[PDB]
Design a protein around this ligand. Structure first.
Ligand SMILES: CCNc1cc(C(=O)N[C@@H](Cc2ccccc2)[C@H](O)CNC(C)(C)CCCC(C)C)cc(N2CCCC2=O)c1
Length: 373
């Protein structure tokens, strides 16, 4: 009954329906594996259709502590408190959790996104103000009999499914390949190799993980360390040289459009990200097609064409495998076994020539540890 319980709009995040307070106040909350704070708009804002009204909740408890959270994009400040929370289209349980009441924000809420809050699903180590603020999932597991695990199937209006407490076999095909969660703070993993159209980038694998690599459903793009990003773009341009695009495109500052239905998918290469396996020197790879890294930008004004933005960008905080990477894959966040599984999704991207895939195992003779720290 949790299938297709996610909605969203490209580049604006995926959200699930939740209720906070008593009586229940329904709100759409963005699913974010890239942070650990559960926060909801709690005051009027230009882009908010509704918000959390603490005065109307008889079960609310103020913690008398303020909180500030800065993201890559946007930031907000609010008041900490606790209240009862439930997930209509999820496990039928009610738990008391910490909630940050957003009273001030900057470039956080998105006009027309349809969500009013965020659910940080990562670990307490990155929660603000500090790790003593128990994240929502932790509270959920402690207070209920929900297994310490959740899976996300993001599909490219959009939708998807967030299965809490288990794995839904009808949401993927083939095998599930697991990569270790290197450290329990962000969902940190290790990339051991990167290929652009079968051609290895030939780089010390530590570069791919400088200073860390994570799985973040709350970030749109595939963000790469400067060195890797430059190498990647050079290779993608080479592969697509039959057409020349302005530098602004490769910088993600400009759209590229083609007449409706004529996008030349074939001139863009497949990007392979090899992830560390559960066994020494073993790995598996997930393949990304341009249908994933060329994000469609819907606009009625430009509807005679199909327009896209390059969804691969530079980062100075490590590799971020965002939503465009997760789309088309069934991703299992097995917190109980400190590992993340990937499998081809029931809504995977593909055309008559290529398809997104999860393949393994691959072996490496190199004995180097790809971990940066
Ligand atoms: C979906 C909206 N699009 C985005 C979002 C973000 C972004 O910062 N997302 C937040 C959550 C968030 C913030 C605002 C609105 C919605 C969700 C995420 O937690 C960061 N995780 C991090 C990176 C791990 C940081 C967590 C900080 C906390 C203090 C732990 C970056 C994007 N960018 C920036 C350039 C490329 C790109 O795609 C595009």
């Amino acid at each position: 009954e949790m299938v297709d319980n996610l909605r969203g709009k490209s580049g604006q995040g995926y959200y699930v329906e939740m209720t906070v307070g008593s009586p229940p106040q329904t709100l759409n909350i963005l699913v974010d594996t890239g942070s650990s704070n559960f926060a909801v708009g709690a005051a009027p804002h230009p882009f908010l259709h509704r918000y959390y009204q603490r005065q109307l909740s008889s079960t609310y408890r103020d913690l008398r502590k303020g909180v500030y959270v800065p993201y890559t994009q946007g930031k907000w400040e609010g008041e900490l408190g606790t209240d009862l929370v439930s997930i209509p289209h999820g496990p039928q349980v009610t738990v008391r959790a910490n909630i940050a009441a957003i009273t001030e924000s900057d470039k956080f809420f998105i006009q027309g996104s349809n969500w009013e809050g965020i659910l940080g699903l990562a670990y307490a180590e990155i929660a603000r103000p500090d790790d003593s603020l128990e994240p929502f999932f932790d509270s959920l597991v402690k207070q209920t009999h929900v297994p310490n695990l959740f899976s996300l199937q993001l599909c490219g209006s959009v939708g998807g499914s967030m299965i809490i407490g288990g794995i839904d076999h009808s949401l993927y095909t083939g095998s599930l390949w697991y990569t270790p969660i290197r450290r329990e703070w962000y969902y940190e993993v290790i990339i051991v190799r990167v290929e652009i159209n079968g051609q290895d980038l030939k780089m010390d694998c530590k570069e791919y993980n400088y200073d860390k690599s994570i799985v973040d459903s709350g970030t749109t793009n595939l963000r790469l360390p400067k060195k890797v990003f430059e190498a990647a773009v050079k290779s993608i341009k080479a592969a697509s040289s039959t057409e020349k695009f302005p530098d602004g495109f490769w910088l993600g500052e400009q759209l590229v459009c083609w007449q409706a239905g004529t996008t030349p998918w074939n001139i863009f290469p497949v990007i392979s990200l090899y992830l560390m396996g559960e066994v020494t020197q073993q790995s598996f790879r997930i393949t990304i097609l341009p249908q994933q890294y060329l994000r469609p930008v819907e606009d009625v004004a430009t509807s005679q064409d199909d327009c896209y933005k390059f969804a691969i960008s530079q980062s100075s905080t490590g590799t971020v495998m965002g939503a465009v990477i997760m789309e088309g894959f069934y991703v299992v966040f097995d917190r109980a076994r400190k590992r993340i599984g990937f499998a081809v999704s029931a809504c995977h991207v593909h055309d008559e020539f290529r398809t997104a895939a999860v393949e393994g195992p691959f072996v490496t003779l190199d004995m180097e540890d790809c971990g940066y720290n």
